[PDB]
Design a protein around this ligand. Structure first.
Ligand code: 08N
Ligand code: 08N
Lengths: 182, 182
């Protein structure tokens, strides 16, 4: 099924990178390799769709825990940071794959913009405090990559030192905030 | 010699993480695991010695390129940033290996203290501008990991989009400077 292949592609891309074979992915999904291509016509297609599926999963937990009572930009961003830190901690495979898929040459401009416009409110809540350079078409991926690099580092230190996780998350957040916001 | 094991360790920890087995390291170097254990009594000893050797290779490349006439603290830091990014693009396995080793649990803090004190002038150069949080005993490793996560993203984008390399290095540097310095 389409769902069993996206899950195998998630784990494979997280462990082996974007160079994961489609022969490994369908095999790790219980279907033959031909079924993979009858759902995802090309390697690049599965790359782009899984990005859309992973970003949809990630933001749906971003906005799910977001307090709509909050109106201050920084406090609101602290909510989204804590949710993203928690999502990666609760879903280590999806976070690793969404990292390697956001980086890649293979993501088309249509998938990149649709990943932002899929949740328009959260986009404006996740972008309208940024350095304007990081919302440009040419540096938006890089801006997402600095954020995710800082978040991953925050995840690792926290899971490996739970007593201090509360401080890693706060320090990581302020560091991210000075790095990317205006 | 040991160099084959140290190099195999670099490639393997950069690929399969600190979780990489002693057997493949030894095997990808064409030496017996026993011999690996004849030179490194534990996997922990291997990981602490490797971190020392890898930090020495990186720090000396940093000081090999310094200009002793750069007396501005921020400009001097930008030179060191340029060196580190350059060192990471020329040796992506050594750089990828240094990030996982530095954030791992099994690295004794006598080891990483010895890593910073083998180049004391470099140590005080790159740490003189840092916030107190990131010079603390508890959050020093966290500061190095945030720096390295930002540099790694900078290297990844500069290598894959070289038409825009200069912007990534500059934006990466300024992002890092806001995140970690007073
Ligand atoms: C609604 O659509 C989106 C919003 C924001 C982002 C992406 C995105 O599309 C899927 C993306 O791919 O990456 C960022 C990045 C990010 C967030 C929140 C931020 C921030 C960020 O990095 C620029 O800067 C300060 O607040 C949320 C989590 N996400 C990893
Ligand atoms: C030799 O002595 C050292 C100096 C600086 C650092 C370490 C170190 O020991 C090996 C270290 O392990 O971590 C940092 C980190 C780092 C550098 C340069 C920086 C910086 C850094 O991290 C906070 O911030 C401001 O500029 C250089 C590279 N290195 C990865």
């Amino acid at each position: 099924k389409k769902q069993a292949l996206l899950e195998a592609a998630t784990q494979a891309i997280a462990q082996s990178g974007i160079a994961a074979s489609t022969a490994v992915i369908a095999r790790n999904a219980g279907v033959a390799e031909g079924t993979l291509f009858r759902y995802f016509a090309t390697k690049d297609e599965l790359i782009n769709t899984l990005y859309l599926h992973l970003t949809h999963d990630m933001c749906q937990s971003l906005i799910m825990e977001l307090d709509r009572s909050i109106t201050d930009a920084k406090m609101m961003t602290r909510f989204i940071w804590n949710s993203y830190i928690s999502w990666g901690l609760n879903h280590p495979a999806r976070h690793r794959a969404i990292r390697q898929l956001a980086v890649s040459e293979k993501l088309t401009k249509e998938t990149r913009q649709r990943a932002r416009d899929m949740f328009p409110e959260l986009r404006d809540l996740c972008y309208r405090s940024l350095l304007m350079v990081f919302m440009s078409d040419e540096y938006r991926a890089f801006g997402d990559g600095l954020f995710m690099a800082l978040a991953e580092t925050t995840m690792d230190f926290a899971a490996r030192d739970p007593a201090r996780a509360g401080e890693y998350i706060a320090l990581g957040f302020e560091a991210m905030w000075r790095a990317l916001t205006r």
